[PDB]
Ligand binder design. Structure first.
Ligand SMILES: [Mg+2]
Ligand SMILES: [Mg+2]
Ligand SMILES: [Mg+2]
Ligand SMILES: [Mg+2]
Ligand SMILES: [Mg+2]
Ligand SMILES: [Mg+2]
Ligand SMILES: [Mg+2]
Lengths: 146, 53, 118
RNA sequence: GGUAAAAAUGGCAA
RNA sequence: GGCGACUUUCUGGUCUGUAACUGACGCUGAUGUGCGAAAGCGUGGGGAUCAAACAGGAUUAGAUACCCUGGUAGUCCACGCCGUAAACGAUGAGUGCUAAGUGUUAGGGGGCCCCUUAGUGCUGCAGCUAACGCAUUAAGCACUCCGCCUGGGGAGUACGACCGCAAGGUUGAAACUCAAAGGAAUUGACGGGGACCCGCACAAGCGGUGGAGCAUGUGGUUUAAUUCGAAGCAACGCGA
RNA sequence: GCGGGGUGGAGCAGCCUGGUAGCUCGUCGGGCUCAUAACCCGAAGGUCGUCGGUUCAAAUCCGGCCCCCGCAACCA
RNA sequence: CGCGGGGUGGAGCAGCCUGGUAGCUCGUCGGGCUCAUAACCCGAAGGUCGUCGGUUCAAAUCCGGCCCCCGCAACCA
């Protein structure tokens, strides 16, 4: 019952790091339209990651997202392994990063987000586990790929 | 029996195999005799399928 | 413990329920076999083309360990996994010299079972 | 070729 | 009713042409008398497959089913019996007459074409029909003979008779009861029918409700009275 | 005459071997449905037949009593 | 009383033999999916191997002791 696809909205590059992805991360962190708190958390997290890592914050963030983003996923139709679209890949990566960061035990969000981004760069975070689990279930359903 | 030709792909040979099976109609026959169809029903199917043909 | 058969026959029995691949010498003595069920495929997955491929690959690999290099393929049954099995033999490194269909057909013989009303 | 499986019932009037 | 590998033996019918012969010798057919799918029955033989019953497994609220694994009679042969099927073209047999077009089976005749005989299909006038439809393979137009019908239920029951080893078959009521049973077609509605399309319908997401305290409406209960109205969606922070 | 049993509303465990009340259904509140059933979720409910005894403690062990069930009731 | 065998997540079942390397399968738990249910798929837990010693680079593993269990002989106070 649908006419067709709808054009997606676009985001300006992050001022501090000049990445569109950074802007999208702020949007996922933001709650109730409170942009400033979201930006504050992200920028502080990027400082902490660089401080602990000793490497550029964007580099580790990019390394982190690369590990979290999933090539294949199961879709109910029998679950069939399907290739995640490039845009979908980013959505899942950012969503998983923020959600699993929120479930971490550190007192402040900034520390949780930094620990998550660091862990994902080492391929050891809960978000990484989510990708691995997604890939496993996709491989189990490889027979239904057709 | 399809025999792989010299300098011919196994996949290419597989294409030849599939076509030979289709002409033989061994698949067609197998499906028909999976379950028993009462004599009158068999005769009806023969007629109407021929009507299609 | 180690045979040396260069030329053999690969028999693929593909059904709607399962795929079984047995590799034999030309005299019908078996060298290796694999099935969708043997590889741990269950239910619908047993009849999938992927399961047929994996069965073929496993059986081929074991047979090659007995020194099989060339194979003649005989196919029986109407299941979806026949072609995948044939490609798997080639992929395993065995060369398919010939492919033949051996599915049994009666010349109006024994009464088939009842049709499934459901 | 298919196929998902299960899937009961409901006063007579006007 | 039926009849599908091939071979041989015995045997029935039909069609074409010809026009030797016979010379109306024909048609129908009550009562009779035979044949008659499948299941079933008797005696003997056989038994692969399939498969009532039956037994597990499963499904389910239950599942004495559907589905799965088995499985006996039976399915097969011979000889008897049974005598029934939506035994249907739901269309008795015979005869003649009445537009065409096209396919096919077995012939005949004359120049691939035309003509013709007997079948077998499709399409289609006239005519017919409640309509659907039928239409030289009539359900048209006619004549002969036979069988059969006269609202639905009770009831193909009861009783009697006959037939059958049995199962049952054939024949076949009434009391009583109802105002209807029915055929075809039409418009809707509906469908665990189809096609094609939409809608925050789903999917993909985000934030909630259901859990706590409280506010408020409602039900219920209570009360002297707890005013009256709203009740699935489309009553319930609704009239207010 | 001699055994067995009496446990939420029903049926059935726990007793042998004292400390522990289970299971299935039902009931009740909520949900699903237009509604009902089915199904889903949460919850309540048995002084263990009855009086006694023993024991720190009794469904449990022991003795009466009542109820129920089975078996026996023979030789003349 | 002699002889033979065994003791390993809750349980069963290997590696023991042929020392280094406790697996396997159900029972669990949490998830996914199933309208659903089950099944299936994914993750996680539970035995330090009967026990105690010796030997050994290293022993559940081998050698010993000890205990428990099972089977078979012993079965003419
Ligand atoms: Mg009604
Ligand atoms: Mg018969
Ligand atoms: Mg059956
Ligand atoms: Mg009759
Ligand atoms: Mg004609
Ligand atoms: Mg609330
Ligand atoms: Mg209900």
């Amino acid at each position: 019952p649908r006419k067709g696809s709808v054009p997606k909205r676009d985001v300006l590059p992050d001022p501090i790091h000049n990445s569109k992805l950074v802007t999208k991360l702020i949007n996922k962190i933001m709650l109730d339209g409170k942009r400033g708190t979201a930006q504050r958390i992200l920028y502080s997290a990027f400082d902490l990651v660089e401080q602990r890592s000793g490497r550029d914050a964007l580099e580790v963030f990019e390394e982190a997202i690369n590990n979290i983003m999933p090539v294949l996923e199961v879709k109910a139709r029998y679950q069939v392994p399907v290739e995640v679209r490039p845009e979908r890949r980013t959505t899942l990566g950012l969503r998983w990063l923020v959600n699993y960061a929120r479930l971490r035990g550190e007192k402040t969000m900034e520390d949780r987000l930094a620990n998550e981004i660091l862990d994902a760069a080492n391929n050891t975070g809960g978000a990484v586990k989510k990708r691995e689990d997604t890939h496993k279930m996709a491989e189990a359903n490889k027979a239904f790929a057709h | 029996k399809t025999v792989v030709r010299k300098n011919e792909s196994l996949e290419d040979a597989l294409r030849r195999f599939k076509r030979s099976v289709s002409k033989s109609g061994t698949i067609q026959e197998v499906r028909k005799r999976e379950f028993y169809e009462k004599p009158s029903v068999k005769r009806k199917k023969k007629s109407e399928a021929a009507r299609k043909r | 413990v180690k045979k040396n058969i260069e030329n053999g026959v690969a028999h693929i029995r593909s059904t709607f329920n399962n795929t079984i691949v047995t590799i034999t010498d030309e005299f019908g003595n078996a060298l290796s076999w694999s099935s969708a069920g043997a590889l741990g495929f269950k239910g619908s997955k047993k009849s999938t083309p992927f399961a047929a491929q994996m069965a073929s690959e496993t059986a081929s690999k074991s047979a090659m360990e007995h020194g099989l290099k060339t194979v003649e393929v005989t196919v029986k049954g109407p299941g979806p996994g026949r072609e995948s099995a044939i490609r798997a033999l080639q992929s395993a490194g065995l060369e398919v010299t010939a492919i033949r269909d051996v599915t049994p057909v009666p010349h109006n013989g024994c009464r088939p079972p009842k049709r499934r009303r459901v």
